[PDB]
Amino acid sequence: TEQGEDITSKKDRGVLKIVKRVGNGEETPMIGDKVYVHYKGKLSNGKKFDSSHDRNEPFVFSLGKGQVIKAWDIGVATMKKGEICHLLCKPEYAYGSAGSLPKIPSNATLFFEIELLDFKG
Ligand SMILES: COc1ccc(OCCN2C[C@H]([C@H](O)CO)[C@H]3CCC[C@@H](C2=O)N3S(=O)(=O)c2cc(Cl)cc(Cl)c2)cc1OC
DSSP: OOSOEEOOSSOSSSEEEEEEEOOSOOSOOOTTOEEEEEEEEEOTTSOEEEEGGGGTSOEEEETTSSSSOHHHHHHHTTOOTTOEEEEEEOGGGTTTTTOBTTTBOTTOOEEEEEEEEEEEO
């Protein structure tokens, strides 16, 4: 609980969550919903590797369909509309030992700030 709440089903500390702003939303998105988020991702050296804010449009994906790294299918499923959270995503829940060059190094813990903007069934 020092670095956040373990939200993994295994309780292996692989995805840790800190709420930054509570959503006024009531339900989480459901599997298959189209979800709309803003995010900023940083490496452990503090370097921003990507941000939807920098494109001035949301990132959109279907929840729970393996369209994104595991940490996101887990983390976004816990969020309510309007919520902002920080997610610490160990490599086993992200890009693993390979990484994804050039932007993601090998064995990289990823640090996301995610805002849940909307979702639609
Ligand atoms: C089922 O397993 C995966 C499914 C998809 C995977 O990567 C592509 C999807 N993706 C990329 C998006 C953006 O489209 C990239 O600009 C982005 C947001 C959603 C989470 C994650 C992300 O999951 N990434 S990212 O911020 O971790 C990311 C940014 C950049 Cl610049 C490069 C890469 Cl490789 C990842 C990766 C997966 O496993 C490693």
